[PDB]
Amino acid sequence: FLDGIDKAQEEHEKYHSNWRAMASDFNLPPVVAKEIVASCDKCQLKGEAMHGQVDCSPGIWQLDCTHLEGKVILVAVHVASGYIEAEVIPAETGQETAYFLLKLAGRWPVKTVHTDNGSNFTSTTVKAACWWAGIKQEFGIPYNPQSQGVIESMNKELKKIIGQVRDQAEHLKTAVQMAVFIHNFKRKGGIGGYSAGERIVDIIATDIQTKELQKQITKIQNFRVYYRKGPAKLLWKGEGAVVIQDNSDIKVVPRRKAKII
Amino acid sequence: GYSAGERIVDIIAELQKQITKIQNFRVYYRDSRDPVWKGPAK
Amino acid sequence: FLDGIDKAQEEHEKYHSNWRAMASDFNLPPVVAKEIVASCDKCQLPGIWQLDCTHLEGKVILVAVHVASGYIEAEVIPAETGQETAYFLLKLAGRWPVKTVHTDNGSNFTSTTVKAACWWAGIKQEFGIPYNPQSQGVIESMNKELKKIIGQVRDQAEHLKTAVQMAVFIHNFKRKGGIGGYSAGERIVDIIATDIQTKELQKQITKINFRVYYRDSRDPVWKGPAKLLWKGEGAVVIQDNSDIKVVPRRKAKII
Amino acid sequence: FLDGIDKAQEEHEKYHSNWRAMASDFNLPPVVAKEIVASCDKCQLCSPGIWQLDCTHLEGKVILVAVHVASGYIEAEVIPAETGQETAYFLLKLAGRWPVKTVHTDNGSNFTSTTVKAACWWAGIKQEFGIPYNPQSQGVIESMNKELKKIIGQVRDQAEHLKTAVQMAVFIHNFKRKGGIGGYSAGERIVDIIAQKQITKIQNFRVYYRDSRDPVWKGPAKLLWKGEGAVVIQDNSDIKVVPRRKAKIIRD
DNA sequence: ACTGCTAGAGATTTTCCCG
DNA sequence: CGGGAAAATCTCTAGCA
DNA sequence: ACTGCTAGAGATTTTCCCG
DNA sequence: CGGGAAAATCTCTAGCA
Numbered sequence A: 001f002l003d004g005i006d007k008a009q010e011e012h013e014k015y016h017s018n019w020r021a022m023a024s025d026f027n028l029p030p031v032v033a034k035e036i037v038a039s040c041d042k043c044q045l046k047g048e049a050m051h052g053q054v055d056c057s058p059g060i061w062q063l064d065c066t067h068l069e070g071k072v073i074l075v076a077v078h079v080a081s082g083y084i085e086a087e088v089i090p091a092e093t094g095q096e097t098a099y100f101l102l103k104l105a106g107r108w109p110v111k112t113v114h115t116d117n118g119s120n121f122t123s124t125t126v127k128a129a130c131w132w133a134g135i136k137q138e139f140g141i142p143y144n145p146q147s148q149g150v151i152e153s154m155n156k157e158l159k160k161i162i163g164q165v166r167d168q169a170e171h172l173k174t175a176v177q178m179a180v181f182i183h184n185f186k187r188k189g190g191i192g193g194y195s196a197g198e199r200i201v202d203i204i205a206t207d208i209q210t211k212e213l214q215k216q217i218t219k220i221q222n223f224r225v226y227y228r229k230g231p232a233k234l235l236w237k238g239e240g241a242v243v244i245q246d247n248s249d250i251k252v253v254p255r256r257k258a259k260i261i
Numbered sequence B: 001g002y003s004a005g006e007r008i009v010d011i012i013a014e015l016q017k018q019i020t021k022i023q024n025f026r027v028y029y030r031d032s033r034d035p036v037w038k039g040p041a042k
Numbered sequence C: 001f002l003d004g005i006d007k008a009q010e011e012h013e014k015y016h017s018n019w020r021a022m023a024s025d026f027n028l029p030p031v032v033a034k035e036i037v038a039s040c041d042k043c044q045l046p047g048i049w050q051l052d053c054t055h056l057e058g059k060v061i062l063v064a065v066h067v068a069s070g071y072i073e074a075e076v077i078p079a080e081t082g083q084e085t086a087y088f089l090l091k092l093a094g095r096w097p098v099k100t101v102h103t104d105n106g107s108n109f110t111s112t113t114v115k116a117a118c119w120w121a122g123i124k125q126e127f128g129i130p131y132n133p134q135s136q137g138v139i140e141s142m143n144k145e146l147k148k149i150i151g152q153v154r155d156q157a158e159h160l161k162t163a164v165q166m167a168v169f170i171h172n173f174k175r176k177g178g179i180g181g182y183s184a185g186e187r188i189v190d191i192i193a194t195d196i197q198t199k200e201l202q203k204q205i206t207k208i209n210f211r212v213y214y215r216d217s218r219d220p221v222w223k224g225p226a227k228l229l230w231k232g233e234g235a236v237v238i239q240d241n242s243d244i245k246v247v248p249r250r251k252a253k254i255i
Numbered sequence D: 001f002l003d004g005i006d007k008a009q010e011e012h013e014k015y016h017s018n019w020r021a022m023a024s025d026f027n028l029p030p031v032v033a034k035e036i037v038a039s040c041d042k043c044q045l046c047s048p049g050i051w052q053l054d055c056t057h058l059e060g061k062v063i064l065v066a067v068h069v070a071s072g073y074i075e076a077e078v079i080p081a082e083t084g085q086e087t088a089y090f091l092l093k094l095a096g097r098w099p100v101k102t103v104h105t106d107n108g109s110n111f112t113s114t115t116v117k118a119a120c121w122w123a124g125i126k127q128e129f130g131i132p133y134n135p136q137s138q139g140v141i142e143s144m145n146k147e148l149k150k151i152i153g154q155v156r157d158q159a160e161h162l163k164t165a166v167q168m169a170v171f172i173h174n175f176k177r178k179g180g181i182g183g184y185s186a187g188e189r190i191v192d193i194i195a196q197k198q199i200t201k202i203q204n205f206r207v208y209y210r211d212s213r214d215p216v217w218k219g220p221a222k223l224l225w226k227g228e229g230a231v232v233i234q235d236n237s238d239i240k241v242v243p244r245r246k247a248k249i250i251r252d
Numbered sequence E, G: 001a002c003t004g005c006t007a008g009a010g011a012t013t014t015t016c017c018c019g
Numbered sequence F, H: 001c002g003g004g005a006a007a008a009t010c011t012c013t014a015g016c017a
């Protein structure tokens, strides 16, 4: 292929032909043509085809403003449940945002808030509010709304319901509260056939109850598993398996080659 | 040198109840490369 | 860098020495130390060897020394012509992985044959006075000690060349001393095994290479290559000319 | 090709090895290496301290070859004549490069010569004549002889005198041919194989005696053990322990 | 070092109910 | 065990940024 | 009575080649 | 019939409007 490699490179600096073109024309193994393309800086123009996944921890909220009929609507969503909070604010200011976030934190457990990099969420007043209530702030990558896919999807859902009930109310703020009500309690679906209100209550109660249950379980139950190794702490056992926490690492081991002390 | 109360309280301070309780909860989850949520797991 | 390497850099700023400390005491790979001394404006500066000559008893003796361990490779050469020095340098290069050689500018080393020897084997050579001629003084003192050795051994060898070799071996192995009384062989072997492990360590250090091409934010144009720093699920962190950026994996390409 | 691949090809022309270097060191894909070796006309495709020695002839010239059993690291040099004295000189030159301990020969007259025994003595090298008593090196010595002959068969086009071609082949077989277990060139493996010193390091270690009161007495102790948060040192006629904060260790 | 999601419309497969 | 209908699960899109 | 598609990057499965 | 690598097929995205 020594002859063809030099020619395909010259043709690539003119044409930037993809690897199949070089492999067909200059009789090349697919790996060599691919290497020619790969080392071209002008031919690197496409990302990888995948999507990430947002954090859906029980304490994470996603926030964003949305605009409707010239007014600013500050919308928050609890990621795990789909529950929502929303108000019309007078302006997209850091002060209005600090106030909204303080109200949210005083009504619901809020461990982390995830927003874009708009001026209102990045402001020092919002920081001071988040420091006071103990809220971690996660800032999305700039110009990447998929980072806040949940609240963007929920802003669509809320705009649709506001459109549905707009002529039942004079002012926009009231339509926003009617739509919030409707979404939280008058729309069922999702993981447990729930409405979002039912679902957030279940998520938060489940968090509380499982925390308590397993804390008591670990207080009373005390063992040490040796597998394969060191004194691994026991997490669970059953059906020919054991769960252990060895140096902050959780691994599923079969019952064989595993002895409990 | 412990009072009868101290020994009583220590003694009184089962697990299968709490374990079945924990095993009653449903878990919906995803694998790190699949957008669809996986059905209720135990 | 690592906290140890940052501490070594701060110790350099405190003490104006780069290679003599972090390459030895801090176990830094030689490539990083070379990069640091290159960046260091205060630093004007296992594969190092030196070659020299001596004229004991009217005969020409050419001696090589591994600087880091007091090893000896020597041979009585029939003549000072560069042709025979080329053959002997071929021997040194074949027997051990020799990377750089420090000699003088003389025609005994600048001849065409020596240049061909370096070209074939892959050895770099220095011609002239080294920046630290105290090493040359040390090897000359070793030459004098070999000469005293010879003044003793020549009671045992019918041919002075053979006594030259006998001395080479005595100093390699029997004359153990320094630090903890170690022979030149022991230090040589330790150094070269450490060198193998440092090649492996340099590989694993440089692992954590990757060119990243990425779509910048709001920009239609793709840019790169950037250095990859960290790779999560969904996003990466990239170094594009001392400018740390975070890019979703949809908008990046890692080669 | 890439600058690295072109450099690898030039290194092949310099060293007559294709797969053992670019497939391993240069991370070349196996298909490209296979294509290169196909195009390459020159590519036809125990007890450490135990070495073999042997005599070979080529084009009317005599070559003495030293091998290592434990990794096939091969030393060699052209000999002026088959006489025993030259053999003794070569074995001498061997002694100073590695701790040779026992060698095996073919019981030849030039090797049974007395001077060979003399050299083996004053250097401290033992001779175990006959054939080696392990059923690996017995054919391995001849196999590596054939390997050296084959390497010279390609080297000879770049050297008109055997005295240089032999060293060319030796460097190739020592480093530029990497294989075996994981692709380790013989030189690397022998580095590993070669790798009382630590005992002699601490023989003369005396200690300035102190105690938990943190005194400045600095008694004439002898260091017995170090580590695990304290020391173990003898105090004249008795034994005690001292934390590392005290008990300075010095040479006697 | 961070990350698309949600809800509805129609298609497909599974389950349950009388045999 | 067999259909047939009712329920549950699957595929796929717009629209939010 | 008209209508999403294309090309590349990485993952997964299939096929072929020496055994 | 078995691996292992090389080739072919599959999944999925941006960007065009």
Ligand SMILES: [Mg+2]
Pocket (backbone or CB within 6 Å): A064, A065, A116, A118
């Ligand atoms: Mg926004």
Ligand SMILES: [Mg+2]
Pocket (backbone or CB within 6 Å): A064, A065, A066, A155, F017
């Ligand atoms: Mg918005």
